[PDB]
Structures are given as structure tokens and as C-alpha cells.
Amino acid sequence: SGFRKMAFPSGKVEGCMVQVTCGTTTLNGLWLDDTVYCPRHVICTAEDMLNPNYEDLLIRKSNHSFLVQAGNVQLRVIGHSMQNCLLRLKVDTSNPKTPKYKFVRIQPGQTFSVLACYNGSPSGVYQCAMRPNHTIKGSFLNGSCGSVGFNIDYDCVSFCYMHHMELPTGVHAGTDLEGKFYGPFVDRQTAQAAGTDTTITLNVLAWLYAAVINGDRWFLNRFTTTLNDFNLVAMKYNYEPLTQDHVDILGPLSAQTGIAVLDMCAALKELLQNGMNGRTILGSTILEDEFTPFDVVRQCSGVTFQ
């Protein structure tokens, strides 16, 4: 029993973390086989960040312009290319700790574990969600750039995030492992800001199922709703609209608890209109939206406390 924001175990990722220095900038890189991935802005100084041309800054670099350090061992760079907003550094050694891996592009609403690193040394691990506005609410200090996000299926690490920047609101932006950013953001210091965010409806719903699987039914009601009547309520409370596809995904959780999705949607609709007042769900005073349906199935018992 219990329900916690839970990260994947981080050791497969830890044995991949290195330090990358170009000139006076130092940050983290990801070492798989004979490649090290990192943010291209490692080639930038503070003044170039205002208006950098990366093609022009990069061509001025050689292989020995880059220092890669794995523990106390220096890796020798023997090739380098730019891929979108990443650098790919070829090194003289394959990482012997390379796990089975994939590079995936995560969709808004999905969750992943972040291994926060400074100087190529892992310092902590936490879970977060890709927000609808393409930011993550992370915890990152100077030097965390090139820290990665990942999920783990069996023994395969699916890398989905590399850290690049912090926006003026205190939330975070970065790229997949192809160097393509999440959201309309760019790796230069300009006036750019998080777009307006919305609550992830699918997740809230899933976490209400989680509550039921663990044994709580207090927020249920005798009502049902149409998909469309729910969305008229949703949209006034700044929830994402629910789609038939989201209703579909909730099938297994629906089947485990015997609660019809649109019946749980009526239950949510009532929580939005009436509040919780004094009452908690799974320990929480508020409606939580950073657990996917998948996160709930993975963590909860397959057997409902009826």
C-alpha cells in the first residue's frame, strides 16, 4: 500500500555520465558506446548566448578543443558533429557500462526520471512530467545542463530528455536525444517564456483510479457524464479536454475497479465544482496530475482493496 512519486533506479544511467569542457564552460555529457552527447552551447561563452551562431562557433573548434572526463580518466575526442541542438563527440573508447538503450521523443503528459548531475557526477534523482506547455518543473542549478531524463523498460533505458535551460518562471526546457527541443524554445538567451499551462486530465483520472485500487471511494457519485459535457466543465477549470483515446487508455484501470471512465469523469467533474474541502486523496490536498495511467499500473497492486 501507499502511493509515491517514484523514479526508475538510476544506475544504468549513472555509468553513462561524463564531464565535457570546452574552453571555460563545463557541463555533463551522455556516454554511449563511442559517442558522448551534450548541449551544443558548451562551445558558447556568456556573450555568445545573447546571439550565437553555432555553425560559425563550431567550425572554429578542433577535436582537442573538447575535454571529456569519465571518472578520473580522460577520453580522447576523435570526431565531432552537430545534431540540431546537441553535439556528438566521438571518443577513443566505447563505454563498457553502455546499457541496452533507445532514444525516444516523449509526448506531453508523459513522465520520466531525471538524474541531476554536476561535473559529470550524478547527484540526485526525481520524477517529473512533460507539461502540456513543453516545460518540466525540475530542480536544476548552474552546471546541470546535459543531465538526462529516461524511463526503463525491462533492461532497456529509453532516454527522452537532455537539460538545456531554465525559463524566467523557474521551470525547465531542453531536448530529446536527437537535439530537437520540446516546445517553441531555442538555446540562446532571449525573451522567451513558458506558454500557458493546463492540467493533465488523463493523469488526474488515473490517480483517482489509483486511490480506488488502494481502497478509497469517497469522491465517487451516482452520476455519469457525456464526454462533451465533461469538457465544457474541464475547459472552465483549465483541464485539457478529454478525448475518446484518453477514455480508451483508462480501460485496464476501469476494468480493475469496476468504475466506468465517464463515471469517474462525473466524479472528477464534481471534485472541480465542489472542491475537496478538508479531505485528502492518496494523502493529497489537491488533484495530482504527474502520474500517467502507466505509472499507476506499474506502482499499484493488480488486486483492488474492495
Binding site: 552551447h41 548552474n142 545542463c145 538545456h164 535551460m165 531554465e166 538555446d187 538567451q189 525573451a191 517564456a193
Partner: peptide, 4 residues
Amino acid sequence: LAAX
């Protein structure tokens, strides 16, 4: 809005 800093690169980190």
C-alpha cells in the same frame, strides 16, 4: 531564462 539562462542556459544551465
